[PDB]
Amino acid sequence: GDVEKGKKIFIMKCSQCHTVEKGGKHKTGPNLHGLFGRKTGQAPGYSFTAANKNKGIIWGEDTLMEYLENPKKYIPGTKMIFVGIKKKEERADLIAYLKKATNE
């Protein structure tokens, strides 16, 4: 579960829709800008589906694991078009990379 292993998850499955670039840009999906320590569904340019706001718990290390197991069930109302990440090891490298890049 680290950054260098973890970018090889996001760049493969995710970067086709998302970015993690400082100063922000827009794609099929949001820029992840300061994702950790918050709920989303509200930002000046991002997260237009809002079950992301109403889920009662933040993005963190054991909430992204269970979201990424099956997205449309953990957030029952999202534009996240992705079925689920079968491995927990890959989810753990992915979350590690995002904690380095979203806080940067």
Ligand code: MH0
């Ligand atoms: C484009 C079809 C698409 C792919 C592929 C994709 C992969 C991954 N996502 Fe997505 N994603 C959305 C929301 C999230 C989300 C919350 C972001 C926020 O609220 O700012 C997270 C943490 C996340 N996605 C993570 C991953 C990830 C890792 C991968 C690869 C496994 C939304 C919903 C936001 C909105 O309402 O606009 C969209 C549109 C979305 C698209 C895609 N994600």
